Write a protein that binds this ligand. Sequence first.
Ligand SMILES: Cc1cc2nc3c(=O)[nH]c(=O)nc-3n(C[C@H](O)[C@H](O)[C@H](O)COP(=O)(O)O)c2cc1C
Ligand SMILES: Cc1cc2nc3c(=O)[nH]c(=O)nc-3n(C[C@H](O)[C@H](O)[C@H](O)COP(=O)(O)O)c2cc1C
Lengths: 196, 196
Amino acid sequence: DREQVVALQHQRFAAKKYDPNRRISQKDWEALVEVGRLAPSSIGLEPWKMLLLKNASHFVIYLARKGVTYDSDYVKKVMHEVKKRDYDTNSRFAQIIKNFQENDMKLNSERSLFDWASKQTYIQMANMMMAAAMLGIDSCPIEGYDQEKVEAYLEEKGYLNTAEFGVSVMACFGYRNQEITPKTRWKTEVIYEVIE
Amino acid sequence: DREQVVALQHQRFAAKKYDPNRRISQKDWEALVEVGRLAPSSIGLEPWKMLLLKNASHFVIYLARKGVTYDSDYVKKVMHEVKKRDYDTNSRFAQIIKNFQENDMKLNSERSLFDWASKQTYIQMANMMMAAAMLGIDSCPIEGYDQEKVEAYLEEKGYLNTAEFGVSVMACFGYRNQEITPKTRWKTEVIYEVIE
Ligand SMILES: Cc1cc2nc3c(=O)[nH]c(=O)nc-3n(C[C@H](O)[C@H](O)[C@H](O)COP(=O)(O)O)c2cc1C
Ligand SMILES: Cc1cc2nc3c(=O)[nH]c(=O)nc-3n(C[C@H](O)[C@H](O)[C@H](O)COP(=O)(O)O)c2cc1C
């Protein structure tokens, strides 16, 4: 019920202290990765790839694809292989994607295109954290790293092709070893308004 | 259990056809807005505001704040009013925010700053769609609008101060009047990899 739904939003908090002797089970972790696999994305393009840093219980680096444009190899690939659509750059549909990105959304630079794909990964990460809370597992979203040094690092180890992907965001997962931090938020009237 | 958690991810789909005679109850809607209020954000800044377009059952326009920088009026405001932190631009902490944004995240333009705040709103919208699915309510995330015309429109009606906010994304909520669309996604090995 709605009481339970709201309660879960308090259970989900940014856990900073983790129980080093309790790990997420193999099966629970596979379910959370599945949650990430099944996340929605704009135009269904899934412009992402997740890395588990095995080398908290589990640490995920979310990658977002670069240059995901109507005429890109990746878009043609996902449309054929996943969507089973006979996609080509001169179709009405390709042209709808082109207008949507270039004009509707002003995705006119490499950075704006990358940040657009990165937004989709925030859905993917959010869904995982919320599913983790449903399983009684804690998480913390993580932006606090130097993106240039991290990407140099990953590229050096051979786990990032910087032409194709950039690092988007990270999250860790495990079991908390601290109390649930009470929420502090703006009051409803400040962050929500009805138009007429 | 994990079976139920994964099942929910199939229940949540992009509903395009809605039952025009069934509306979300007042209490269920207030719970979903609460889900949006309680969403996490980078540095806890909540750089957002939601609008219900009342003038699917419920249509939400997610706004993200512009120019949310270490020295901005908004950051000083949220730190004091919500976090009850005696924040000032010359503190170690203000300087950590400055370095994080400018250097770690390369937020060096109005657009990059705006898209960073917009990413946080995708978490907010994701959490609402997932909570909606927990309540048996359907949703569709929506990027398919012309951002310039929409923002001109909202500004004209007096519901958008374009100096302070931009439109980030939209979503609609209600009850489906069609079958659940089966998921099509990349296979696990394509979108997920373990480092060592
Ligand atoms: C995208 C994003 C990035 C975050 N990055 C960090 C981080 O790098 N380090 C950290 O300690 N907390 C990080 N957080 C946690 C936020 O401080 C926290 O979510 C926010 O204060 C709201 O608190 P709550 O998550 O407990 O509800 C991040 C949160 C978000 C959503
Ligand atoms: C951020 C984003 C924006 C979307 N915008 C639209 C849209 O404007 N119009 C539409 O029909 N569907 C839109 N969708 C729905 C996607 O096509 C859909 O999520 C994707 O194909 C995956 O299918 P599923 O959501 O049913 O799992 C959007 C989805 C995302 C996440």
